[PDB]
Amino acid sequence: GFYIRALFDYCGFLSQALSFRFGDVLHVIDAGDEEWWQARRVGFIPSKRRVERREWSRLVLSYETVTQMEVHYARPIIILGPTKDRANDDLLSEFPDKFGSCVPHTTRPKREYEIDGRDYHFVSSREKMEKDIQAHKFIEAGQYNSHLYGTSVQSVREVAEQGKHCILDVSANAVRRLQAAHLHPIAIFIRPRSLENVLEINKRITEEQARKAFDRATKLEQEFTECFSAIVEGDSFEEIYHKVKRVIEDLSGPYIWVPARERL
Numbered sequence: 001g002f003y004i005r006a007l008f009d010y011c012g013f014l015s016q017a018l019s020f021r022f023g024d025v026l027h028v029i030d031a032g033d034e035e036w037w038q039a040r041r042v043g044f045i046p047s048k049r050r051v052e053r054r055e056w057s058r059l060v061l062s063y064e065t066v067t068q069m070e071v072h073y074a075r076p077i078i079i080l081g082p083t084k085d086r087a088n089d090d091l092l093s094e095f096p097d098k099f100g101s102c103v104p105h106t107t108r109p110k111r112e113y114e115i116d117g118r119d120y121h122f123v124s125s126r127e128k129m130e131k132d133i134q135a136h137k138f139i140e141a142g143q144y145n146s147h148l149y150g151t152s153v154q155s156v157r158e159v160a161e162q163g164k165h166c167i168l169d170v171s172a173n174a175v176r177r178l179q180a181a182h183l184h185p186i187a188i189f190i191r192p193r194s195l196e197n198v199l200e201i202n203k204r205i206t207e208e209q210a211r212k213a214f215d216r217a218t219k220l221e222q223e224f225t226e227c228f229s230a231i232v233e234g235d236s237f238e239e240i241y242h243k244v245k246r247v248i249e250d251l252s253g254p255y256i257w258v259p260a261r262e263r264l
């Protein structure tokens with residue numbers, strides 16, 4: 001048969017319908033029917049056509065074909081959503097031998113106490129930086145104050161090829177760039193269940209910051225759900241943290257599922 005990854009979670013009606021969650025990889029055994037396919041998590045599941053029809057009438061993400069490949073590098077990590085900074089900080093602190101950060105590039109002048117190749121790869125001219133960016137040398141870049149900063153493909157590769165998970169502090173836009181560079185990341189979205197939930201997973205921030213965080217999360221999910229490797233939720237940060245680690249463990253290893261060429 002073939003394999004697909006669910007991009008959504010699936011009246012009181014009982015049937016042989018298989019339940020699944022976002023990110024589950026499914027082994028499709030029989031897809032001859034246009035409405036229901038026979039499958040098993042790696043019952044029946046609604047076909048792409050059926051999911052789309054229902055969603056359209058309700059008011060589209062359904063599934064994407066995937067294939068298993070062997071990788072010899074450690075997958076970079078991109079944690080997104082509320083509390084991601086604490087999660088990034090804690091992973092780096094908890095497993096010094098398994099997680100690391102890459103060295104970013106920048107055009108700003110190096111301070112006297114900074115070291116080139118350690119703090120940043122300090123670029124001589126901004127023109128050179130822009131050229132490399134145009135040459136697709138960066139997974140992501142931006143401007144702060146009046147200087148450029150960027151996470152280069154090579155800097156990430158160096159960490160990944162070394163066998164350690166590179167903790168990235170970049171937007172969801174980087175996922176496709178990393179995939180194309182053959183540095184398949186583990187993108188984890190921490191989804192707030194409500195405004196109240198945000199207030200529970202971070203007891204420090206104000207109600208106003210919480211509302212802003214919830215709004216960003218909503219927009220992030222609306223735009224990049226297809227790029228997430230997994231979506232985690234929890235009643236507390238501790239629960240979120242535990243789940244983030246479980247995902248990384250589950251999606252690590254030599255064999256990973258990546259987008260396939262076959263199309264539904």
Ligand SMILES: Nc1nc2c(ncn2[C@@H]2O[C@H](COP(=O)(O)O)[C@@H](O)[C@H]2O)c(=O)[nH]1
Pocket residue numbers: 104108144149151169170
């Ligand atoms: N997300 C993200 N922000 C960064 C990164 N490197 C620097 N920054 C941002 O740029 C600001 C200025 O950093 P600086 O110029 O002092 O090294 C930081 O406070 C931070 O917000 C990075 O790798 N990822």
